[PDB]
Symmetry: D3
Amino acid sequence: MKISPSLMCMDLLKFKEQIEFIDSHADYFHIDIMDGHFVPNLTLSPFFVSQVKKLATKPLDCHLMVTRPQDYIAQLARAGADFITLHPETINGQAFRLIDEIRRHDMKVGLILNPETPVEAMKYYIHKADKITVMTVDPGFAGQPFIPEMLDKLAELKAWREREGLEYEIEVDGSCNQATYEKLMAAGADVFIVGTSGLFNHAENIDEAWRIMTAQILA
Amino acid sequence: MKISPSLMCMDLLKFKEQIEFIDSHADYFHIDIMDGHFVPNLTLSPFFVSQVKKLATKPLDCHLMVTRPQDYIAQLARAGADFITLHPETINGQAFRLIDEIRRHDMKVGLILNPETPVEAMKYYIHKADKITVMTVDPGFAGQPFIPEMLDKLAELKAWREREGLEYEIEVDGSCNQATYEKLMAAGADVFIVGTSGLFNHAENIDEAWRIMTAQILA
Amino acid sequence: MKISPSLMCMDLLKFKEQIEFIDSHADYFHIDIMDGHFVPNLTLSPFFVSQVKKLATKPLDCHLMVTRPQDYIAQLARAGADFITLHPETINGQAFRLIDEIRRHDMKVGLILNPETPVEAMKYYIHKADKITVMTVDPGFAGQPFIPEMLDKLAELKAWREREGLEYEIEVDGSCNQATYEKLMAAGADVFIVGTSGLFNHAENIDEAWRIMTAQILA
Amino acid sequence: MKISPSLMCMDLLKFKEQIEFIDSHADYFHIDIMDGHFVPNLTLSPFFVSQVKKLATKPLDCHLMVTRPQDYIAQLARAGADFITLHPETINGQAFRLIDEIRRHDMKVGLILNPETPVEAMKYYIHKADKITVMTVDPGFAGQPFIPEMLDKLAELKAWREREGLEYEIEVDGSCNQATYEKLMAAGADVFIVGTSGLFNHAENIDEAWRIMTAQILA
Amino acid sequence: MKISPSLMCMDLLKFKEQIEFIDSHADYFHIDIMDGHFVPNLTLSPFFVSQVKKLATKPLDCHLMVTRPQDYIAQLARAGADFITLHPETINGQAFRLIDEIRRHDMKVGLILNPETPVEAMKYYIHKADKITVMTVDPGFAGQPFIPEMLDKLAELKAWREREGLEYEIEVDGSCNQATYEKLMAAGADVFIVGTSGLFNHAENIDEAWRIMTAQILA
Amino acid sequence: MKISPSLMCMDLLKFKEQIEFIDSHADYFHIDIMDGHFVPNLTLSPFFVSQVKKLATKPLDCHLMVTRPQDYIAQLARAGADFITLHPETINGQAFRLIDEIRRHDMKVGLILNPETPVEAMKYYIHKADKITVMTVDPGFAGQPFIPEMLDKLAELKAWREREGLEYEIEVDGSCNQATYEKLMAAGADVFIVGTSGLFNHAENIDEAWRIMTAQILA
Ligand SMILES: [Mg+2]
Ligand SMILES: [Mg+2]
Ligand SMILES: [Mg+2]
Ligand SMILES: [Mg+2]
Ligand SMILES: [Mg+2]
Ligand SMILES: [Mg+2]
């Protein structure tokens, strides 16, 4: 069960220590890049990616919640991103072109669906993804209501992968915590994007927080 | 001669130490908040403001390079901003409304003009500003060509203040460094927004960097 | 067979009398709120809703043909709306958030599909709707050509409700008149939004108009 | 001193009586048409204009607070508008074209400036206007703070008219009431757009309301 | 096997001769009309259509890669277009209205899907199309990578036509050349839009070019 | 008196001959590149520039009537443009950046104002222009009403050049014909952009057309 900490939830006062801890414990760094337009909020950016790059060995995954993802691929590659997760709802008319550009920069391809987007949306290019993520909450902020209906999406995504003989990992984004770990794993999740409720909030010290989270995942 | 370090140019690995140093040496924290639309880039956000707030006593100045500044005033106030610098080119039809909202949150008012916007743009509300900033480079990125033509704008802004008996501070944003300190002061600048070329770049250690910059300002 | 008169088709000269008549004869007040952007036209608004509220006991249903439905929920609730009908094509990325906000204001949830949007568009939240409406004409104006192809959508919507054990009412919007009553009922319609051709136009006096309409529905 | 009642402030329950009263007492009908985009609100529309047309002899003045005024000229002419008031900030690149279209429909030309727009904005076509209006409040809603700074704009507009030998009427829009009548007349206003605070609010009965307003204008 | 030369790939120096040759050899003239917004590029326009009209008898097919197809139907009809090919992704909320407008102008209806749009997108109006085109490359430019995944779309489109008893022609747009002729025909293609790689590039002289292409189609 | 033929008005049937004639008789090729958004129309594009480049020695001047001029500079340079004429109303926040990019491509800088934009709009960078053009008609189409008011703009532009000791050429765009030649020269025009009414329309044969135009300019 892979872990991907949401950096928009970290403590910048302990930036260096938290990144180093995460780099030696987690599987991915989840970096949210918002537009203020595709979603009503602003969080991280290439600048943040560039800084995390200084002490990272694990892959930096940039979730592009922006209107024009085409504008950030080259810039994000230079900042040190390893994964570029695209929203199918922002790439109609350019999905293949962008996926090629992403790989031309030696980065991996991620696809992320918000609540109301069906998996078929990616049917013609789902086989080009290394990881597919399911928003279990409408995008934009931390601490929003979990959307149970998304469990079926996780399952459908798992069945699709098996039936088509694909190898993409299934990730979950949105209120991944003690109240949802079980259902999510049962549904088919391979990766957990953990934020404030699932990690950082358990202890002011990240070691203790991670230990607590790890213990809770046990069940 | 007041100083306002551009935080999008800081080193997050030494976040806590750099903020504390800046808080006891500078006059303002310059926090750039970009849209990806008003300017083609993404840098800081309310989240960032919130983190800097943890150890700040000096005022946090949020430069709103966004299409809809109305969407960030309440959120920025809650994150701990003290100054909200508005672009006149984004408030036609709502300048007075926003200025009132800014003060209802007990924050100071800043006005910032990019290169091609004349000072008259603010003629009907220039007297409500605590600080007026002049972009000496087209907004968006660090390390762009200085625009000499902007010197007249700084001067005009100083003459306007005197002639109208106003008290706003005149700030400069864009390539403030050894090559421009003199001309800028002569033109009428009161505050220097210092970034990579003017500060951070002089020494890996911020104390030493600040010493070098201060020395260069001497001339 | 429930009736919902389209108020953008009423006679303001007899505002008070028509609203009172409608309030004691119809099941819903259909209030169209257009953007000028989502659809190329402008009709009613919160102001209108507020006025109708003065003498209404039946529920006011606000059909949001706007780009940003999020901007009107609180304002419409305040004006007295009881139903907020959302276009699935304007809520991708915020359907669950908005549906929660609507209920937080004690209003009922409506979902409306224009001609080219399939029912699956609502598959993950169709069970949260009190009423689902089918546009039988491209949105925007009154008196446009009926779209027969929409009959299958009404049917599919009825089969879906039965198969999933749901209780939403099925509404029809667009050229509901003598020429379509039969087919619409046969297809599965529960509610008729009646405008100029189906109601108001039959007689300058609304009692007589309603009488004629009721008689025509008989067949 | 001409009067132009803001219809978005009227009582629809007494639609017919208020329009008839206004038609025989006022000089213009002020009809606000909003986009939800140019200004954050929705009020009246062509439908509304069409209804007022049924009993009007005085000119219907449609204030276009919309992003694309070009989309409403033919439709508004068709609904019965007599005046089309354009926002200079929405016609750059098409002012002359639109002014010609307005006159090709036999309608008069109005120009309206919001707070932060200087009179020079209209310098190349100011001589084509029958009436020029000054927003004394940021556009969008009723009951907002009066903007004293706008008095100079009214004056400048009067001086311009005299100096250039023009004949346009000067109108005021925004918090025209007892607290501002005097200053506005002194500044140069020819027409008062009266809303809730200046008219409708004085008495539930419009005759009495109008009587009180007229008396207050006396001073 | 019908041919439709992409005019954005022709040689304007030999305009008259190439159009005349094409008019007596091809089945359609493929005229690309781009927005700079729907796709990131600009190519042909009504002006171009008008010129080709001077010597054409074969139908001019205008592929509308624009944000607002509604703005070009009357103008294109006037310039002499015979076919208007619409993108389903630009007509939600107005497909039936536009299709009717196209036919009021006595023009034929075309529907074109870019890579990531499924055929169901047109399910409610697919029967109104004379020709349906499949983009085998993300729209915008010539010489992009062929998308094999689109072969299934061509097939599905053929099965749909048979199963529903429809008569639309199936067209292919994007890298139609020697490397793809076979697979495309096998998949179900009826018409080939030929550009630089498939036609013009084979010989500076268009007769010779057309010969080479025809020979390659043989296999 | 320099001449710049508007190619959107040429005859493509005689493409090669007209370009060659123009290349040996005119001073510039005026190539209009429209967005469909900045102005409501579509005309020429990089493709067109590329073709004219095949037989041109005189400079190709691309007038960018587009929302995002930044998207076309590299592409246009590649196609062979020599002049890039920018609209000040589309470069606020990037005028200096774009002007630098234009020169990095070894192209000359043009600035074009539509009717309602004052010359001051360019005050901070007017000295970087090789040619400044005045629209004497709202942009978008050929054959629109001449705007006399623009004569003052031409004059002001000439006075500005003299007073500031600049060397830019003054160009006129819009209904340059027999009815306006005199006034335009008197006002200060240095270059005439000639279209259908001023050139092409005088004779089906371009030699004769040019002959007639040249003679009319004599007066
Ligand atoms: Mg995320
Ligand atoms: Mg800044
Ligand atoms: Mg409706
Ligand atoms: Mg108004
Ligand atoms: Mg094409
Ligand atoms: Mg031009």
